[PDB]
Design a protein around this ligand. Structure first.
Ligand SMILES: O=C(NCCc1ccccc1)c1nc([C@@H]2CCCN2C(=O)c2c(Cl)cccc2Cl)[nH]c(=O)c1O
Ligand SMILES: [Mn+2]
Ligand SMILES: [Mn+2]
Ligand code: NA
Length: 178
């Protein structure tokens, strides 16, 4: 599974994921499912931001903390939107709202509720993907067109199939905690 991650994901994603783990004292060579999950969430955030017109989205996830908040605080100043209590994943210039992206190994509704309680910043929009093709979004508003969302869902499915072909999927699927 460590070799799986290093083979499956772009090196920039893998480096960001290793850093995120190390900043909390975790070893990517040991907590390997966590390693994969963080890689997956990052790649989904980058694909989402490529999903619309050029310049439609601002990426917040994947930046160091100081630059992430500089982006958020900048956007709050130029558009007047409310400042979130915690770092979101993207800003949508078209809809003028922050977006929290979730990727789940359980199912989308339990995760949606959890991030609704976890974030609770009433203004941030929540969009969840599963590995089996379900999605769930705030007020049933899915932001991107069907083509873009289809591309994300197809990519998660491929990862699932690839894990299972290597016999890693069952441990990964069971490793996500409330
Ligand atoms: O922005 C995120 N994290 C910002 C920093 C942060 C760090 C801890 C708690 C809150 C926020 C973020 N995080 C997660 C999930 C759930 C919370 C932790 N986590 C991780 O991926 C994760 C990371 Cl980052 C580092 C080490 C281990 C893990 Cl398990 N899911 C998201 O969808 C997401 O957007
Ligand atoms: Mn995030
Ligand atoms: Mn997220
Ligand atoms: Na979060």
């Amino acid at each position: 599974m460590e070799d799986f991650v290093r083979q499956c994901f772009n090196p920039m994603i893998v480096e960001l994921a290793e850093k995120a783990m190390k900043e909390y004292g975790e070893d990517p060579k040991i907590e390997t499912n966590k390693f994969a999950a963080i890689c997956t969430h990052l790649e989904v955030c980058f694909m989402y931001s490529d999903g619309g017109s050029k310049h439609r989205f601002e990426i917040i996830e994947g930046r160091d903390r100081i630059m992430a908040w500089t982006v958020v605080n900048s956007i709050c100043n130029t558009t007047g939107v409310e400042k979130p209590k915690s770092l979101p994943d993207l800003y949508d210039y078209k809809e003028n709202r922050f977006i929290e992206i979730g990727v789940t190994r359980r199912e989308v509704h339990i995760y949606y509720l959890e991030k609704a309680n976890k974030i609770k910043s009433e203004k941030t929009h929540i969009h969840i993907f599963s590995f089996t093709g379900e999605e769930m979004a705030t007020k049933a508003d899915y932001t991107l067109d069907e083509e873009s969302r289809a591309r994300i869902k197809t990519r998660l499915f491929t990862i699932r199939q690839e894990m299972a072909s290597r016999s890693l999927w069952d441990s990964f699927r069971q490793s996500e905690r409330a």
